[PDB]
Structure 1
Amino acid sequence: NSFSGYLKLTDNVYIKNADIVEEAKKVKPTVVVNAANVYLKHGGGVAGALNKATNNAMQVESDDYIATNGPLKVGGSCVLSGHNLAKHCLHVVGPNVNKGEDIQLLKSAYENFNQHEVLLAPLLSAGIFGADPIHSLRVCVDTVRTNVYLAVFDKNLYDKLVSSFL
């Protein structure tokens, strides 16, 4: 793909200080990952921002998905359209550690990435779900074996992540 300006972290994990929405608009990847909740209610953070960029089409599609299939599992995922941003969106639910959900489920969440050869993705559980971002990055690197391009919006956090020893 046309991923540009990324820093290599490992054999298969690359990182960039960017809004995942802007990266998706530029690159139009096969798969963009959403940091979803089990109800696919895309209110804020990555999910709200991706949905807004689709003019709410992501939410309309998600509502039909839930009406048919019910909620996702914590640690689970589903593949839906990427609309104008990507071919597909992999909606992945990391644990909400601020609500007592088991942080071990973060590994299960990242395992979903292994079903896709290349992904543009955020750090799961590292926003309002309250997991330590360095921990989320470590779980990502230790779990995902396919090619993952991570976008981290916050500059201060990015700078910290890339100066940390995993």
Structure 2
Amino acid sequence: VNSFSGYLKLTDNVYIKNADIVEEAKKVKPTVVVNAANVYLKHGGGVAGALNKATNNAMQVESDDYIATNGPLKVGGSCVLSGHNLAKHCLHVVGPNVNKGEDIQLLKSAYENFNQHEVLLAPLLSAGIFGADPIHSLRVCVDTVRTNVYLAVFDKNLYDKLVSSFL
């Protein structure tokens, strides 16, 4: 039993809700919130910009030190950093950005990072401003993640479209 509320159950392990991931994380304080990151951990917009804003830029400050030490992430890769005031940990995961010409096949590799954590609050990777098809992102999530994932979908029409089209 966990403290996630109001989710629709899609499979044995994948749950979905229409919600702002920032507000969800503040309420639940999950062990892990997933950020839709880029390789430079520059949290400018989308989920990343919103999560960073909610930390009063502390996420960005921590991220800049991470990059200065380690260099950029790989597309499809991840790192674990602090969750600040939102969660215990933030798993920064880089899905391919179609608006940069990155290979969509890397979306499966990106979701594989979730399997290192028993329970996660997450967005749909490569959706939104990353330019991929969200129906596809959900399909890959369900077919790749085996741990318990609580998906927060920002947009209501998308959420309803995602639920109504789910196989």
Q: TM-score range by the shorter chain?
A: over 0.9
Deviations 1:10-46 (A, max 9, x none): 0000001000000000000000000000000000110
Q: How far apart, CA to CA, are the structure 2 residues paired with 1:13 and 1:3?
A: 12
Gaps in structure 2 of 5+ consecutive residues: none
Q: Secondary structure at the match of 1:58?
A: helix
Q: CA, structure 1 residues 40+99, in 2 after alignment: closer, same or farther (shift >3 Å)?
A: same
Mapped partners of 2:142, 2:136: distance in 1:
10
- 5+ unaligned residues in a row in structure 1: which ranges? none
Equivalent positions of 1:131-146 (< 5 A) are 131-146=132-147
Shift of 1:127: 1.1
Residue 98 of structure 1 deviates from its aligned partner by: 1.8
In 1, Cα distance between equivalents of 2:98 and 2:114: 21
**Equivalent residue number for residue 34 of structure 1:** 35
- Report the equivalent of 2:109: 108
CA distance in 1, matches of 2:75, 2:146: 21
Q: Select between 91-100 and 55-64 the one with higher mean Cα deviation.
A: 91-100
Following superposition, the deviation at residue 97 of structure 1 comes to: 1.3
Determine helix, strand or coil for the equivalent of 1:128: helix
For residues 150 and 165 of structure 1, what CA distance do their matches in structure 2 show? 14
**Deviation readout 1:130-153 (Å, 9 max, x if unpaired):** 100000000000000000000001
- Tell me whether 1:47 sits opposite 2:31 in the alignment: no
1-structure distance, mates of 2:130, 2:9:
26
| Equivalent position SS for 1:34 | strand
Which whole-Å CA distance do the structure 1 matches of 2:99 and 2:46 have between them? 15
The CA distance in 1 between the partners of 2:104 and 2:64, in whole Å, is 27
Aligned length: 166
- Once the two structures are TM-superposed, the CA of residue 165 in structure 1 deviates from its matched residue by 3.0
CA RMSD across the alignment = 0.6
- Separation in structure 2 between the aligned mates of residue 55 and residue 129 of structure 1, nearest angstrom: 23
Distance in 2 (alpha carbons) for counterparts of 1:98 and 1:42:
16
Alignment match, 2:20: 19
Distance 1:126 1:50 in 2: 16
CA distance in 1, matches of 2:130, 2:29: 27
Aligned equivalents of 1:43 and 1:159: distance in 2? 27
| Percent identity between the two aligned chains | 100
Listed one character per residue, the Cα deviations across residues 69-89 of structure 1 (whole Å, up to 9, x for unaligned) are 000000000000000000000
- Residue 162 of structure 1 corresponds to which residue in structure 2? 163
Aligned counterparts of 2:37 and 2:88: Cα–Cα separation in 1: 18
TM-score (norm: length of structure 1): 0.99
